[PDB]
Structure 1
Amino acid sequence: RTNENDPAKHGDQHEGQHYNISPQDLETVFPHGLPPRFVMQVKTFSEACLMVRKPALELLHYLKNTSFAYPAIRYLLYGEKGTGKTLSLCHVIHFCAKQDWLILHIPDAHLWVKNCRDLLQSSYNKQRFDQPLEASTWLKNFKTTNERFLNQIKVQEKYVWNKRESTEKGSPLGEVVEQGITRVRNATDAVGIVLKELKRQSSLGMFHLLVAVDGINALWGRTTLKREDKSPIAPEELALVHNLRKMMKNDWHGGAIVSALSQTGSLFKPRKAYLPQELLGKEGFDALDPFIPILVSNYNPKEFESCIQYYLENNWLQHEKAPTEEGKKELLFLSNANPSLLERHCAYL
């Protein structure tokens, strides 16, 4: 528990201590992408405290020392399942939002490669498929996250939607976002336009971009979406995945491509696969190369004690034996200090 709530000042001195997020910040920065269980925990406790951990701190150091002139660097959070990669990415996202970046947040790329009821064909490229529902969902979330920059940022092209409808150069990007959201059929095209405009304009210093992609491994993997003829679909055919891959290239500058691997929800991957190559494959690793891998490991004893104290103070651990040292040791063993395992255990304990 820290009196430090600004996401920039805290450092190693605050490592192992909590960091609070206000309700307004939670609503604006994080309308999506937070782990479902952490969302439930926030709902229950009425508070959103994230422990400051070495991975998040190191990523913050890198983003503070980032030279916007250099080509945008790729950071890749990897680690055993439930090590907190997603929440570390969220912590860095909050830090960037407070530093007033433009947060292009992909809550989970896995959702975009599986279980799609509505899979239409792209009008802009007949060889690509649309995912209008997910496109619209992400567009709404992105609008909520970046409303303030949305009006200020302008488009620099002519974007036809229908044979008669289009958006004209100089129109605010909010026009594109509204078109995509209200008109679901155009959600994929709107997402592509948004990505392209942000990528081009970030090199023009109009703002500092943060492409924060959770479950990045999905883009260069396989998909469980089958064509009308029951034909398997590769990721590139999906315009969303194609545009996101384009964004994932360091060719541009003025921002950082932060991403997190996430075996959970992955497709055709063994349970224990957690290393970057194991989770990405040849294509994905080559595409992301060069990149900075950051290891997120289970709680060290100090962090584990801090989290246990947090739960105790919130009164979450109701079991009469939880406060005892024996109970603490039993939790430590049964969770091997793993964040997700400890949270799940304490849920019913």
Structure 2
Amino acid sequence: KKSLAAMYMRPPVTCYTDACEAPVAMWDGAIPLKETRKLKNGVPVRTVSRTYSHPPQLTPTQLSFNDINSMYCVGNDELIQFFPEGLGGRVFQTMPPGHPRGFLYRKETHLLNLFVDKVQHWHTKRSVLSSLTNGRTGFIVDGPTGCGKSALMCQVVHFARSRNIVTLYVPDAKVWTHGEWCWPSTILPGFFDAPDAARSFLKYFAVANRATLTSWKLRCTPKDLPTEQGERQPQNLYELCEWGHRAVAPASIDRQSVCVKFLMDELSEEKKLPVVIVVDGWNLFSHETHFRYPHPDFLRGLASFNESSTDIDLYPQELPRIPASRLSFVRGLNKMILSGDDPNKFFITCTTRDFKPFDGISGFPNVETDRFANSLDEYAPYDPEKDSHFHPIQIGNFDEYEYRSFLRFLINSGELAGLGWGPLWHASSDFERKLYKIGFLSGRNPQGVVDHYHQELVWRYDYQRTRQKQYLLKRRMEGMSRGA
């Protein structure tokens, strides 16, 4: 009854998140409207405002120590600028194009943000950065499944590319290791390539750091590269990556193997510019890729199948599995890690726990109901101290401080953007009931918070709004009986 919707005016839009506001007929009862009275050329000035506003869109230089366990946002034009590769495995599940692009600023997020602030001028802070990593080349971030691992790694490229630092960002390592098809390297004997993962890597890395790679002069790169009519020979590292991925099929298959090897040769010789290398899921690069070696009868050559002493068409067999060290992309990475002549590259990476569940027995997964349909088929245990040369950082689930800030952003800004209950706010409970309940269902696990936020729709045994509407209808009928 008390609407206050016609008297509401729209605030002036300054950023992308302020323009994500829905019409006032949607979120009128979802986010209630209060009125404040200012003293402006008259004692009453009725100003109808929202109780909840969007969290502020801040550049990473404006983020501070007081913003720990708070919520901030990024622009959509800042999203397309700093992320041409994409985001992590499950980061973009909370950002449709109507929603603002929010991020939680944790305390481990503040440690990495001040780290890249010292990476930006590393030559004067070299003894500081060596004591932070304990002499290692970088950090590896490990924890349980669904925590802030890939959600932190996309923040690091937001921290570094806003500080105009050249970044190698692998948004998910399962395109390289668990890819579509594997091809041997053209110029590297005994090495292999992921060609579809490489053309997408050589495309988006050129667009991301075009301001820095155009100033990158080619030091160790042969100038007799094969070049068709109308194309210019590359003189920059931006021109080298555009020589690789921009081609016609099947000439793009062998061009990336030349380009990736000469990219890793050019990066390993640069000792002056800081190059942050961020990899989502380094544990996939630390063990065997899911490809296997081909059978030697395929390359040997046969005249017939009946008399050749082979059974390649009769019975399948499991060859030894190809490790990730035999890939041309990871060969250049492991060259810069193990060789101590590069105090310039900082490998702030993480692991992934996106594997399928297996708890003693296993039937067949139902094709309709399978949350792990695009999950990894590995089942292998991983220890980041023993299987990587980086410093392990252990992050757990949320505590109740940042879980409250993350759930306030999910519920309120979803209904403010026209994606939540809206007019059906009276059927769902209040925020203190939802904070108490989802914290039980998730255990403050960050993927479980997002998952049970969508599973708030199918709650059956919540009786808060039933008893409240019974009390208010009882209070109404006695109020009119008092007036009678």
> Which range, TM-score by smaller chain?
0.7 to 0.9
Give 2:291's aligned amino acid: L
Q: CA deviation at 1:150?
A: 2.1
1:227 to 264, 279, 293: 293
Map of 2:133 onto structure 1: none
- 5+ residue gaps, structure 2, are 1-53, 131-135, 296-317, 356-375, 457-484
Deviation at 1:32, TM superposition (A): 2.5
Distance 1:79 1:235, change over 3 A: same
Residue in structure 2 matching 1:217, options 283, 296, 299:
283
Deviations 1:211-256 (A, max 9, x none): 1111011222112102331633222222122223224446412342
Among residues 246, 263, 266, which one is paired with 2:335 in the alignment?
Answer: 246
Alignment equivalent of 1:110, drawn from 174, 178, 199:
174
- For residues 35-75 of structure 1, what are the alpha-carbon distances to aligned partners after superposition, in whole Å with 9 as ceiling and x for unaligned? 35432422244311101011111112333344623478311
1:68: which partner in 2? 122
Name the residue aligned to 1:52.
Answer: 105
Deviations 1:72-126 (A, max 9, x none): 8311111111111111111121111111100111112232112332x22212123
1:119-138 deviation line (CA, Å, top 9, x unaligned): 22212123112221110011
CA drift of 1:145 comes to 1.2
- Alpha-carbon distance in structure 2 between the residues aligned to 1:174 and 1:96: 19
Please give the alpha-carbon distance, in whole angstroms, between the structure 2 residues aligned to 1:103 and 1:239. Answer: 18
Q: Structure 1 counterpart of 2:139, which letter?
A: Y
How many residue pairs end up in the alignment?
333
Instruction: Give the structure-1-normalised TM-score.
Output: 0.85
Q: 1:276 aligns with which of 384, 400, 408?
A: 384
| Counterpart residue identity of residue 268, structure 1 | E
**Alignment partner of 2:216 out of 124, 135, 153:** 153
C-alpha distance 190-92 of structure 1, shift in aligned 2 (>3 A): same
User: Aligned runs of 1:284-295 on 2, under 5 Å?
Assistant: 284-285=387-388, 288=389, 291-295=390-394
**2:404 counterpart residue number:** 305
- Deviations for 1:197-224, whole angstroms, at most 9, x for unmatched residues? 12322x1x2x321111110112221121
- The ranges of structure 1 where at least 4 consecutive aligned residues each deviate by more than 4 angstroms after the TM superposition are 164-170
Is 1:334 aligned to 2:334, yes or no?
no
Q: 1:322 to 1:298 in 2, by over 3 A?
A: farther
SS class of match (1:263): coil
1:93 aligns with 2:157: yes
Quick one: structure 1 residues 330 and 177, their matched pair in 2 at CA, closer, same or farther if it must change by over 3 Å?
A: same
- Quick one: structure 1 residues 254 and 190, their matched pair in 2 at CA, closer, same or farther if it must change by over 3 Å? same
- SS for the counterpart of 1:219 is coil
- Give distance in 2, aligned partners of 1:196 and 1:269: 34
SS in structure 1 opposite 2:59? coil
Corresponding residue for residue 196 of structure 2: 133
Q: Is the 8 A contact 2:89 2:150 kept in 1?
A: no
135, 144, 148: which one pairs with 2:207? Answer: 144
Q: 1:267 to 1:190 in 2, by over 3 A?
A: farther
Shifted more, 48-57 versus 168-177: the winner is: 168-177
- Structure 1, unmatched stretches of 5+, are none
3-state DSSP of counterpart to 1:218: coil
- 2:64 maps to amino acid: G
Question: 246-255 or 298-307, which moves further after superposition?
Answer: 246-255
Task: Say whether 1:5 aligns with 2:58.
Answer: yes
Q: Residues 320-342 of structure 1: CA distance to partner in whole angstroms, max 9, x if unpaired?
A: 33434222211011111111111
Identity between Structure 1 and Structure 2 (%): 21
RMSD of equivalent CA atoms: 2.7
Amino acid at match of 1:243: G
Query: Comparing 127-136 with 25-34, which one deviates more in the overlay?
Result: 25-34
Quick one: distance in 1 between partners of 2:137 and 2:74? 27
Moved more, 31-40 or 6-15: 31-40
Find 2:266's aligned residue among 192, 197, 219: 197
Question: Cα–Cα, structure 1 residues 322 and 217, in superposed 2: closer, same or farther, change >3 Å?
Answer: farther
Larger Rg: 2
Aligned partner letter, 1:224 = H
